[PDB]
Structure formats: structure tokens, C-alpha cells
Design a protein around this ligand. Structure first.
Ligand SMILES: Cc1cc2nc3c(=O)[nH]c(=O)nc-3n(C[C@H](O)[C@H](O)[C@H](O)COP(=O)(O)OP(=O)(O)OC[C@H]3O[C@@H](n4cnc5c(N)ncnc54)[C@H](O)[C@@H]3O)c2cc1C
Ligand SMILES: Cc1cc2nc3c(=O)[nH]c(=O)nc-3n(C[C@H](O)[C@H](O)[C@H](O)COP(=O)(O)OP(=O)(O)OC[C@H]3O[C@@H](n4cnc5c(N)ncnc54)[C@H](O)[C@@H]3O)c2cc1C
Lengths: 245, 242
């Protein structure tokens, strides 16, 4: 499992805040299509929180919650409902919602993907069905906060993340057909390999993808705001921060 | 600019065929939104082929061409309209439309990007606006042929390409601010470099990206088809003289 770290503790909390604000939309959904999308997203999101039937109850309760409540009201009723459904574990400890709330949620999901691929068993079908759900979650990241330019940017470049999930998928698919997964420690080793029958995969790939992608957005926003850009996050510091080995 | 090789000639020809089939959609478009999008991709596409006013006439002609012509008929009048607008250059020499037609278009566009950044002049605003247009183009590739699964997949992973276009923009943005672009022979030195004062960018980045991506889709399709099972950068550079 994932190394219990201060940073990973925030991630898990922003992840619950994220899931909470997501089901809050359900009341106000103005399309059957978005209602379906929200409820699967939330169901999936809780499906990775470290009982499905109590979660169905929570989701169904959110669908029917009054559209005339404000968010603080929804919050209080949410707290009772998770209390009543023995889902106190879903209750966020902090409700201040920001960009970091989203970054953490994405980082948390990435760590769970690496962990699944680490702790797999030759259940290989299982992890490949999980990864497909992961693709659906990353494809449909809601901002909830307003940042129209963040939404347009993310819909341009989110294939970067989803591309690396498909790599893992291709790696596991090979391990089904006989070539085992060789784990390497650098992204350069991994890409150098796929430029040939090898099956090399970078250890903690998605964490690295997560970190790189976060750095990419922050580099680019200096183009967007038009200014001259000062301490970027690096894979080394990140592994230390998360006790990734 | 681009090494004239046999393979590049086919890319050029598929590029036109792709452009031809796209403007044929305009007459049948079922929304203002698709109409605006098609006519803009078309205008952009011709803008990268080697006058703008005569391309506007062509596209305006496509917009009003009768929705009741079949496509063979549309081809006849396109061949006349281009002949009349001195756009014989935009005439495809082959109309056999296939996945390869699409691959070649994407490959062609990638080569244009790599070429503009190579033949740049420290006109940095010019190429930085051309790349934005390139982003819209890769975001909006129509399959035209019918492959629902293909549209779904490409809509999923297309940001992989677009991401590397942004890298180039981050690269030319740094070169405008005093750190020069250091060109580099491998993807690996590029990615390792950003993980640290530096402005390294791999030579023929988009050709490599185009080739890796093409490989990715074909690897992944043995998952989708549920079956048991490749072009390499070295062979690719030889075939194109990069
Ligand atoms: C999907 C998404 C898309 C976005 N698109 C845009 C956009 O297009 N234009 C725009 O102006 N803003 C965009 N943003 C917001 C932007 O990326 C920053 O969050 C914003 O600039 C706020 O600045 P910050 O430094 O306070 O946040 P951040 O720099 O993101 O810091 C938040 C936390 O994350 C940690 N962190 C910082 N960098 C990294 C890193 N590389 N890797 C891992 N952890 C890191 C830090 O510990 C910090 O605690 C986007 C955010 C998200 C989640
Ligand atoms: C954006 C896009 C998305 C697609 N998504 C799917 C999908 O999801 N599922 C599916 O089943 N099919 C998909 N396809 C079609 C698929 O990739 C192939 O074109 C199709 O399977 C036919 O295979 P082929 O071997 O005959 O042609 P291809 O393998 O596509 O090759 C056609 C030509 O391109 C050259 N070529 C081959 N590989 C490369 C490479 N790595 N780099 C550069 N040139 C190369 C070859 O010289 C060949 O002549 C997609 C195509 C495109 C353009």
C-alpha cells in the first residue's frame, strides 16, 4: 500500500473534499447526461477511497437532495448522512476548496494506480478494469471552482496523463501473454525501451506523470498571463516528500 | 525546409486528400457549429500546404456547393474550382481515403511544426501563433471515415500530442526571454532536462511524437480487439532524411 506520509494525508483529504463538492452538483444538475456523469464519477471516486452499497445510498441521497439548499446546508445534511451510513471515513476534515484540492485529488489517484500495478497478482484482469475506470475519471475532471481557461487548457492536454495509463495497460496486457513487467527507476529508461519484445515500466510512473504534468501547467501559465517567470518541483524532492522507494 | 523524399510526397498527397474530403463535409453540415469548425480547419490546413484569398474563395465555394451532389460530383467541381482559382496545387493525385490518409496528415503537420521552429528567426511571435493554430488542428481531427472506436480513443489520448506542442511554445517563450533553445538528439535528454536554467528541445520532436503515438494506437488495438500481437525512430529518420 501507499506510504503513509504527511503529504499523502493532505491528498486523501482534498480527495474527500473533492468527492463531497462533486456530489453537491447532483442536486443542481441540469441534464440527464451530467447527472449520469456525476454519479458515476463520485461512485468511482469513493470506490478508490481507502462499502459500495452504503456509497450507493449516499449517492442516491445526494441525487434527491433539495436543489434549493445552499452548499453549507448540503454540507450539514451530508455530514449526518455519512454519519448515519457509517461513512464517517468519507467526511473531509477541511472544506476550504482550491486548485490544490484538485491537484491533490489527481495526485492521489495517480498514487493509487502505481500501487495497484505494484501489488497486482498474475487479478490482472482486475487491475486492467480499474485502469479503464481511472481513464474515465481523468477524462472528466470537474473544476467546480470557476476557471474557464483552466478548463479549456486541461481539455487540450489531459490526453498526456491518459496516454500513460494506456501504457501501463499495454504493460499488463503483455504480462498476460508471457513477457513480464520489468520495473525501471527513470522515465528515460522506460521511453528508451519502447523504441525497440521488452516490457519495461517506470516505478511510480503515474506519480512522475502527475508531477511532470503539474509542472507543465505552471510553466505554461506564464505564456498565458504574459510575464517573465521560481522553485520548480523535481522528481527527487517529490519521492522524498512521499517516501516513494 | 522539409527533405523532399518519397514518403514525404505521399504525406503531402494524403494531406490534400484529407483537406478535400473535409471541405466536402461543409455542404452537408447539420449545425452552425460544425460549419464554423470545418471551414476553419480547412482554411488552416491549406495555410500550411506549400494564396490565402484564393483559399477563401475555394472554401466559400464549398460552403454553397449543393447539398444534393454526391461526392463524386463534388470532386468534379472541386477540380474545376481549383483549376479556376490557380489552386491546381491543392488537387490530390489520389483519392483513395484510408487510415493512412489520416496518419499522413498528422505526420505532415508534425513535420511542418518541426520545420517552422528550425527555420525560425529570433519572428518568434509568428511561430508561436502558428503553433496555437496547430493545437486547434490536432484537437479537431475528423475521422471522416467511420471508426467510432477510433474517435473515442483519439479523443482520449490526443492531449499527448498537444502537450508536446506546448513544450515547444514554452521553449520559444524562453528563447524570447534570453535562454536560447538548445537542440538535442534524443527525447530522453529533453525530458531529463526539464527535471532540474535549461532550455533543451529534441530535434524533430514532433516527428518522434507522431511516430511514437502512431505506435501507441497500434499497440493498444490488440487490447481492444482482444488478440495477441513496429516502426522505430531510426528507420523513421532514414525514411524521411531527418
Ligand atoms: C487540471 C488543472 C488545470 C489547471 N490549468 C491552469 C491554466 O490553464 N492557467 C492558469 O493560470 N492556472 C491553471 N491551474 C491552476 C494552476 O496550475 C495553479 O494551481 C495556480 O497557478 C495556483 O498557483 P499555486 O502555485 O498556488 O498552486 P500550485 O503550484 O499548484 O501548488 C499547490 C500545491 O501543490 C504542490 N506542487 C506545486 N507544484 C507541484 C508539482 N509540479 N508537482 C507536484 N506538486 C506540486 C505544492 O506543494 C503546493 O503545495 C490548473 C489547475 C489544475 C488542477
Ligand atoms: C488518430 C487515429 C486513431 C486511431 N485509433 C484506432 C483505435 O482506437 N482502434 C483500432 O483498432 N484502430 C485505430 N486507428 C487505425 C489504426 O491505427 C490503423 O491505421 C489500422 O489499424 C490499419 O492498420 P495498418 O497496419 O494497415 O495501417 P497503419 O499501421 O496505420 O500504417 C499505415 C502507414 O503508416 C506507416 N506506419 C505504420 N506505423 C507507423 C508508425 N509508428 N509511425 C509512422 N508511420 C507508421 C506505415 O508505413 C504504413 O504504410 C486510428 C487511426 C488514427 C489516424
Amino acid at each position: 500500500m501507499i506510504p503513509l506520509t504527511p503529504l499523502f494525508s493532505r491528498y486523501k483529504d482534498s480527495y474527500l473534499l473533492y468527492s463531497f463538492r462533486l456530489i453537491d452538483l447532483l442536486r443542481a444538475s441540469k441534464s440527464t447526461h451530467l447527472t449520469k456523469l456525476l454519479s458515476s464519477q463520485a461512485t468511482y471516486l469513493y470506490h478508490f477511497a481507502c462499502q459500495k452499497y452504503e456509497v450507493q445510498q449516499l449517492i442516491e441521497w445526494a441525487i434527491n437532495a433539495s436543489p434549493d439548499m445552499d452548499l453549507q446546508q448540503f454540507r450539514i445534511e451530508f455530514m449526518d448522512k455519512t454519519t448515519e451510513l457509517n461513512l464517517r471515513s468519507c467526511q473531509p476534515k477541511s472544506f476550504t476548496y482550491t486548485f490544490t484540492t484538485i491537484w491533490d485529488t489527481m495526485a492521489f489517484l495517480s498514487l493509487i494506480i502505481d500501487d495497484m500495478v505494484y501489488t497486482r497478482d498474475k487479478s490482472l484482469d482486475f487491475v486492467m478494469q480499474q485502469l479503464k475506470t481511472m481513464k474515465v475519471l481523468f477524462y472528466n475532471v470537474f473544476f467546480i471552482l470557476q476557471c474557464a481557461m483552466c478548463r479549456d487548457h486541461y481539455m487540450n492536454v489531459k490526453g498526456f496523463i491518459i496516454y500513460h495509463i494506456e501504457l501501463i495497460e499495454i504493460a499488463l496486457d503483455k504480462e498476460k501473454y508471457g513477457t513480464d513487467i520489468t520495473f525501471v527507476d527513470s522515465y528515460q529508461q522506460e521511453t528508451a525501451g519502447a523504441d525497440v519484445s521488452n516490457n519495461m515500466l517506470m516505478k511510480n510512473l503515474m506519480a512522475y506523470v502527475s508531477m511532470t504534468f503539474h509542472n507543465h501547467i505552471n510553466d505554461y501559465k506564464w505564456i498565458q498571463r504574459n510575464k517573465k517567470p521560481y522553485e520548480r518541483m523535481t522528481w527527487g524532492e517529490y519521492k522524498k516528500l512521499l517516501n516513494l522507494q
